[PDB]
Design an enzyme around this catalytic site. Structure first.
Site: not given
Ligand code: GSH
Ligand code: GSH
Ligand code: GSH
Lengths: 146, 146, 146
Positions: C31, C104
């Site tokens: 939104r 994060r």
């Molecule tokens: N789906 C996740 C799988 C791996 C993961 O959990 N990465 C961590 C550390 S790079 C993360 O915070 N991912 C950020 C996100 O998923 O947007 C990704 O695209 O990175």
């Protein structure tokens, strides 16, 4: 009741470990291709690793739900074995897809066969559970009349 | 204990079958719009089908978790019925969203009401379970003093 | 058996509520930034909120699976506590990521430690369950020969 679900729990944990492996591989690909969150786009090779992990993640609850229902209502050993076949096929799917979109297909079909079998076992188990009481209620109602 | 969870298991399996249907519809849309993995972007109509499936997939574990907690701690039949209403609303959400973003909204609200009810049943069930022992421990501590 | 899993059920419900909170925050961001489904792209700030929710959603079944296996096979209280630590870390991850990609990381590491501990408890619980019967079957086979 540890005793009647320990094999389902073991296959469940193996599934978790495999999903952790996929996640660690995506992180490795992010570093290699320098694709920083929040992006999920980049070169096709990065996108394939990302997508392979996401696809495995979105089916993972279906696998858990069916594994447990089939294992409880049909047979624990058979559900566990189908679960192991599913997970091995998913590992191959992830490895295949990472290399090329086309290499995802054979293991995807194997994973789908294993999951469909779990679905079928779960359904047969539930039918065996409900169908009797239902056909009986039906007959008792027709006996009353007759 | 097949006996006390068979309706929860049946609604669980129905949910799995519905998710399989969504997945098969995305594959059908990929073919129709010629959108090859690893892409998840394309014409709005393809993206709506993809997104409808993804949204259903990401709520699916919430639905399973709440279904089982509500069904075990509150009442099996009531949890199962709310689960069925949720799943029918999700089917409508998927069908609606595929046709247009705006048509996702009414069934989304219906699904959210069904899921919130499951959450409320689960919470009430857990309160009934814990609150007594807790108020008792509290009182025993004040009695000791008094 | 309400009695032996009520804390696991309570942590499960808390996890569902947290995921609902993430979902409501994404809707709020849609939104605010006027990003209409089916788009999931937009300004980095919108994409961070979206991505934080998606990441939490894809680990959520891993958390549920491990929570229940560890809680049943290892110890309910310890699994529940690790689950609470995981969920608090995920809340911080979501809040951090929304503010900036870099924020994060600390809570992501805390969540990973909590989840790895659940995995370790689940594995130790299953080893305690299976290893004995297995070493016994092994020995009975060697006794026969010997
Ligand atoms: N789906 C996740 C799988 C791996 C993961 O959990 N990465 C961590 C550390 S790079 C993360 O915070 N991912 C950020 C996100 O998923 O947007 C990704 O695209 O990175
Ligand atoms: N989310 C999936 C749902 C349908 C599906 O599982 N498709 C298979 C065969 S096209 C697949 O390998 N998807 C590739 C992917 O998800 O990246 C998709 O976008 O395609
Ligand atoms: N992942 C969802 C989380 C929030 C949500 O469930 N939003 C509702 C109302 S905007 C929705 O229909 N999302 C559409 C979608 O996920 O494609 C999103 O991106 O919006």
């Amino acid at each position: 009741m540890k005793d009647e679900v320990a094999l389902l729990a073991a296959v469940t944990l193996l599934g978790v470990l495999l999903q952790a492996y996929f996640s660690l591989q995506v992180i490795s690909a992010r570093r290699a291709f320098r694709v920083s969150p929040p992006l999920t786009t980049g070169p096709p090779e990065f996108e394939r690793v990302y997508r392979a992990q996401v696809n495995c993640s979105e089916y993972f609850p279906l696998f858990l739900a069916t594994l447990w229902v089939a294992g409880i209502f049909f047979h624990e050993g058979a559900a566990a074995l189908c679960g192991l076949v599913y997970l091995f096929a998913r590992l191959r799917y992830f490895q295949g897809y990472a290399r090329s979109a086309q290499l995802r297909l054979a293991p995807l079909y194997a994973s789908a066969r294993a999951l469909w079998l779990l679905v079928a076992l779960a359904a047969l188990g539930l039918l065996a559970h409900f169908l009797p009481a239902a056909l009986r209620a039906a007959l008792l109602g027709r006996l009353r009349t007759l």
